[model samples]
Target: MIPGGLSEAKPATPEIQEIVDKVKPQLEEKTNETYGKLEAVQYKTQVVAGTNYYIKVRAGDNKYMHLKVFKSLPGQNEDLVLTGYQVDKNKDDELTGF
Candidate 1:
């Protein structure tokens, strides 16, 4: 049996709802365009202590894009981090990993 009164789990509050509402539409548009109609897309938002929220965006085409968003934690300088790369492909029109 789990401790702490059955391990209570809190639902998303209004603050989190507001954040999701504001970002989802914008992200949806961007993702759709970026992935060429997107064979599949998935997103998630998580709230952590001291920070407002964290959002994850995943989309798949012939490849995939995995993105994460969150306000910088205390003592951190950067506000955001963005990274991109090509996958499942090799030089000279060769196919890489599947």
Candidate 2:
């Protein structure tokens, strides 16, 4: 299991916030209609080793997309660790799917 403090969530630091801001526009353009528009980004420190971040984005059609990023400890590269994509597939029920 992941450690308690290690997995805890917190606010993004200035440096990390800068990175998120820089990438927000680009990600919005790339994802297009398949993904949606960029909303907000947040970062959290990992008590265990690396840095963790989450981005809250909305689709052009009103869906929610959550992207999680992870940066390794010192020597490793940062990467997109997880993506939570949600969309409205049908009508009537307004299917809430992720």
Candidate 3:
């Protein structure tokens, strides 16, 4: 159970992996064209806002991006949904409420 009991802090592995695998190629290709020649790619995952997951991606010339995963709520099972994404704007940041 979570602090407010509103939802549980669940493992977002499957959903996160699915999104990364599907979007990775596209991001690589796009960033390569938009930024510069692709240099290296690294993937990291961390919980943010105690209610969301952040996927940090570094794969361009001095570039960085993040994928914000938020609770999608549940009719069957609670899952995460992609809420935001940005590149070269900020690195992993602490979510201090909105």
Number of the predicted model whose TM-score against the real structure is largest: 2
RMSD of 1: 11.4
Q: Which pairs clash in model 1?
A: none
**lDDT for position 65 in model 2:** 44
Candidate order by lDDT, highest to lowest?
Answer: 3, 2, 1
lDDT digits (tens) for residues 1-90 of candidate 1: 422211222333453333443444445564454332222122233334333332222223344333334544556654432222222222
What C-alpha lDDT, on a 0 to 100 scale, does residue 31 get in candidate 3?
A: 52
Give the lowest summed-lDDT range of ten residues in model 3: 35-44
User: Residue 56 in model 1: shift from native, Å?
Assistant: 10
Question: What tens-digit string does per-residue lDDT give for candidate 2 at 17-81?
Answer: 44444454445554564343444333343433465554433324555444444555565555434
Model 1 ranges off by over 4 Å: 1-9, 33-69, 72-98
The local distance difference test score of model 3 is 0.45
True-structure RMSD, every candidate: 11.4, 7.4, 7.6
- Which of the numbered candidates is closest to the native, going by highest lDDT? 3
